Amino acid sequence: GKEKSHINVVVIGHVDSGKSTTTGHLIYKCGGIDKRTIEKFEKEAAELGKGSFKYAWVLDKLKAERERGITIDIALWKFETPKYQVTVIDAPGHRDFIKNMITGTSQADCAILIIAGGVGEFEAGISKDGQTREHALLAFTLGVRQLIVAVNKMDSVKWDESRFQEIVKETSNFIKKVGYNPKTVPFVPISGWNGDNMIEATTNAPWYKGWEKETKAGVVKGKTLLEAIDAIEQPSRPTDKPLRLPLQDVYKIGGIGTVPVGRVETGVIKPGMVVTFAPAGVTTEVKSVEMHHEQLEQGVPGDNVGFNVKNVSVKEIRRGNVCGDAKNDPPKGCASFNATVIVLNHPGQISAGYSPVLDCHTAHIACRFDELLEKNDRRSGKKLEDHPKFLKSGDAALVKFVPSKPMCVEAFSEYPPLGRFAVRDMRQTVAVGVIKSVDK
Amino acid sequence: PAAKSIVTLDVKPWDDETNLEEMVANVKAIEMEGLTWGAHQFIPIGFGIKKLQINCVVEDDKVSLDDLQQSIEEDEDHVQSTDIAAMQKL
């Protein structure tokens, strides 16, 4: 039982791709979620014959049990690989997931695109207006640079090599148009239902020599999807960057006083540091830090911590403010910020003056699109025009935003979790933004 | 069948004295076509405060999570905020 590094993965794909069975199989065989339910159905499966059972049948029963509302575990799902503890999201088709993908915690280190191999199903999945392409575009935009492709339902096309090759070619075109370099992406032919190439290699495709990917140090090869996930590259965590801790809530506890709560996004928080809260600019000492039941010596990136501070009323700090270190690039409010905005498909056009609500870290503030500064080629960033008069679906543009209330944001290159945002309107996320400059 | 998602909501109280059983009773009394409440637990977050962590399963086309969060937050006597702890496709 070796010590593991933690990574986050998001699984995307069309409704007929089988991505839920595929993700569910990995969690079943390499994790421990809802295992009492799994055990009940493994035993029940004796009724189908004399004892044998398929994991896909148990997954089907687990799904129905979840639909009834009687399973116990929460929706935070994990599984292990030789190197990693993986936190995985089988992306919901829910339209409110878009904002959660942009501003939620746990942004992905790698996306896994599941493709149906069948002829009709494959084509339906690569539509330009489909939810799958929007998910891949959002991941690319947010800096998810690693991608694995799994071509599922290979049994339905009889494990035909030509079919796999034509899907690889067509999917390489699909992902290149989003922005990914196909040479860096493993293509794995799998059967999520029968287990081929999931955890163990298939015996149904003698032509299959394995997947490969180019990396900065060389070419990495494997056979299975579990090997492709273990091969994800270890991303550098922001432990040594300056503290940033957006507040989610602020409590007044009898005998303790003020207790802000939030996730450490960058840096580390420790008792005895002197922190500052922005947009207000209040400064104070951290008295103690707690998480779950333990008192901590330090809260590191990813920890959702409570901390007690003196001489700060709950009225002067609130959700959406950002705590950082007074002696290491303290956070500050801004007068405006300029960001690259990618407009998603939606029933409208954007002109200067538009003032929807933006969700950025834990802040929810309407911000004016004060000026449309440039229109750009999305993938390369090249300026196409100065001062476009309007933006339509698909456009990438540099926009100057002015917040309607005091707001603390950051450039995405410096502090990623405080530099990406969702723009809400018409009951949906209509655009995603990446902050490029801030006037503090 | 209709597309669904399983969501875990975090519902935060005002302090360490908020009546948590009332808080979860109020959430579970919310009825929306396509919404199924599931399991819940009260989880310490530090300093004696516990949040409610509750599962629900939603039909994507029928239940707005933005609206559900807003509805839960109308119980101002018990609830300070709500957040999505995690969500998955079913």
UniProtKB/Swiss-Prot annotation, chain A:
Q: Which residues cross the membrane?
A: none
**This chain belongs to which protein, by name?**
Elongation factor 1-alpha
Q: How does it assemble?
A: The eukaryotic elongation factor 1 complex (eEF1) is probably a heterohexamer. Two trimeric complexes, each composed of eEF1A (TEF1 or TEF2), eEF1Balpha (EFB1) and eEF1Bgamma (CAM1 or TEF4), are probably dimerized via the eF1Bgamma subunits. Interacts with eEF1Balpha; the interaction is direct. Interacts with GCN2 (via C-terminus); this interaction is direct, occurs in amino acid-repleted cells, may be stabilized in a ribosome-dependent manner, reduces GCN2-mediated eIF-2-alpha phosphorylation and is lost in amino acid-starved cells and by uncharged tRNAs. Interacts with CEX1.
| Residues covered by region (G1) | 13-20
Give residue ranges for domain tr-type G. 4-239
Q: Where does GTP bind?
A: S20, T21, N152, K153, D155, S191, G192, W193
Q: Write down which residues bear the modification named Phosphoserine.
A: S17, S162, S288, S413
Q: Which residues carry this modification: N,N,N-trimethylglycine?
A: G1
Taxonomic placement: Eukaryota, Fungi, Dikarya, Ascomycota, Saccharomycotina
Q: Which PROSITE patterns match?
A: G_TR_1, G_TR_2
Q: Does the record bear Ubl conjugation in its keywords? A: yes
Give the span(s) annotated as G5: 191-193
The ranges of region (G4) come to 152-155
Gene it is expressed from: TEF1
Q: How is this protein activated or inhibited?
A: Inhibited by narciclasine.
UniProt KW keywords: Actin-binding, Cytoplasm, Cytoskeleton, Elongation factor, GTP-binding, Isopeptide bond, Methylation, Nucleotide-binding, Phosphoprotein, Protein biosynthesis, Ubl conjugation
Curated annotation (Swiss-Prot), chain B:
Tell me the domain of life.
Answer: Eukaryota
Q: Which N-terminal stretch is annotated as signal sequence?
A: none
Describe how it is modified after translation: S-thiolated in response to oxidative stress, probably inhibiting the protein and causing a reduction in protein synthesis.
**Result for mutant: K89A:** Loss of catalytic activity, but still binds to eEF1A
Similarity comment text for this entry: Belongs to the EF-1-beta/EF-1-delta family.
Subunit-level organization: The eukaryotic elongation factor 1 complex (eEF1) is probably a heterohexamer. Two trimeric complexes, each composed of eEF1A (TEF1 or TEF2), eEF1Balpha (EFB1) and eEF1Bgamma (CAM1 or TEF4), are probably dimerized via the eF1Bgamma subunits. eEF1Balpha interacts directly with eEF1A. eEF1Balpha and eEF1Bgamma form the eEF1B subcomplex with the GEF activity.
Per the record, the domain comment is: The C-terminus (pos. 119-205) exhibits guanine nucleotide exchange activity.
> Which purpose does this protein serve, as stated in its record?
Catalytic subunit of the guanine nucleotide exchange factor (GEF) (eEF1B subcomplex) of the eukaryotic elongation factor 1 complex (eEF1). Stimulates the exchange of GDP for GTP on elongation factor 1A (eEF1A), probably by displacing GDP from the nucleotide binding pocket in eEF1A. The 30-fold higher concentration of GTP compared to GDP in cells favors the formation of eEF1A-GTP, which rapidly forms a ternary complex with aminoacyl-tRNA that in turn displaces eEF1B from the complex.
Which protein are we looking at?
Answer: Elongation factor 1-beta
Report which part of the complete sequence is shown.
117 to 206 of 206
